[PDB]
Amino acid sequence: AAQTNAPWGLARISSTSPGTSTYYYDESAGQGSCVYVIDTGIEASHPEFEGRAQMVKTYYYSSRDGNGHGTHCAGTVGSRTYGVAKKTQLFGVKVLDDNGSGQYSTIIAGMDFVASDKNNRNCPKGVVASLSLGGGYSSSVNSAAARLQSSGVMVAVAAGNNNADARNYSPASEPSVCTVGASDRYDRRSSFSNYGSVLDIFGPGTDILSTWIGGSTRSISGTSMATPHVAGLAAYLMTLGKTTAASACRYIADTANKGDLSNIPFGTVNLLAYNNYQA
């Protein structure tokens, strides 16, 4: 299949070079996979989700996304127009309040929740969790991310927007998960993107168009935006049977565009997520 005049990030992950405008992908489109978006919530009623999104847990007074951040990230995973995996099932877990902030204890609870809840869902092609959040180093937060991964869920996490080594941030610094940095449409590392040896992979993160609350759309920037590109790609590849939750991050790194990025500091991988689609 081919989506013309696609958002640049979608085009980039289906091309060996920057500057293209068409998203090429297999029609299966992540059908049969499930992606948990652990964030401020999802506006499930947005027409772009086509009924494929549902809130399953909240740690606040309402399950509504009063912020927009979670709805944006979910859209990049699997909305019709703005998503990588256009037929995946989306589950929302609200661990962040409507100002976009959250306590580490609540974030940990949300991760443990997903590890259990997945056993109550029909996800024959596998399960992914997308975490576009983070803060200062915490061994407890890292441990929760490791548990989630160990339970059989592909965990993708944002590297952080500090233009610094991700080793001092959590859950970015947990080695066993998939830590995602951000790039822009000219194949430069995004100016805000964290780096370091713990990064696994880069994805599009600057000027990313996606869904927003109130049935709208918005372009915003961050490693928060790069992370769902990689989560969606994992769901897509698991549906095609090319990889599993345990090995998806490594598979994505092995099949990535190599050496295409600029302003990558020595010791950080030069790898950009790529779907290797051949018609």
Binding stretches for Pr ion (CB under 5 A): 16, 200, 260
222: its two tokens: 């961050």
Of 83 and 196, which has the nearer Cβ to Pr ion? 196
Examine the residue annotation and report whether 197 is marked as an active-site residue of this protein: no
User: Is 81 among the annotated ligand-binding positions?
Assistant: no
Of 98 and 200, which has the nearer Cβ to Pr ion? 200
User: Is 26 among the annotated ligand-binding positions?
Assistant: no
Give residue 196's region: left, alpha or beta (phi > 0; psi -120 to 50). Answer: left
Of 39 and 260, which has the nearer Cβ to Pr ion? 260
Nearest to 236 by CA among 24, 16, 19, 8: 24
Which residue in 14, 65, 69, 184 is the catalytic one? 69
Of 43 and 200, which has the nearer Cβ to Pr ion? 200
Inter-CA distances, 176 with 137, 167, 179, 247, 265, Å: 15, 13, 9, 10, 22
Nearest to 33 by CA among 73, 69, 84, 68: 84
State the minimum distance, in angstroms, from the CB of residue 118 to Pr ion: 21
Examine the residue annotation and report whether 39 is marked as an active-site residue of this protein: yes
**C-alpha to C-alpha distance for 162 and 190, rounded to whole angstroms:** 11
User: Is 198 among the annotated ligand-binding positions?
Assistant: no
State the minimum distance, in angstroms, from the CB of residue 198 to Pr ion: 7
State the minimum distance, in angstroms, from the CB of residue 90 to Pr ion: 24
275: its two tokens: 């779907």
User: Is 200 among the annotated ligand-binding positions?
Assistant: yes
State the minimum distance, in angstroms, from the CB of residue 272 to Pr ion: 8
Of 75 and 203, which has the nearer Cβ to Pr ion? 203
**Sheet with 33-39, edge to edge strand ranges:** 53-58, 89-94, 33-39, 126-131, 154-158, 178-183, 201-204, 271-272, 257-258
**C-alpha to C-alpha distance for 104 and 180, rounded to whole angstroms:** 20
User: Is 175 among the annotated ligand-binding positions?
Assistant: yes
Is the CB of residue 12 less than 8 Å from the CB of residue 20?
A: yes
State the minimum distance, in angstroms, from the CB of residue 225 to Pr ion: 19
**C-alpha to C-alpha distance for 145 and 153, rounded to whole angstroms:** 10
Which residue in 33, 72, 224, 229 is the catalytic one? 224
Which residue in 14, 15, 33, 39 is the catalytic one? 39
Binding residues, by number, are 16, 175, 177, 200, 260
Enzyme catalytic residues: 39, 69, 224
Binding residues for Ca(2+), by number, are 16, 175, 177, 200, 260
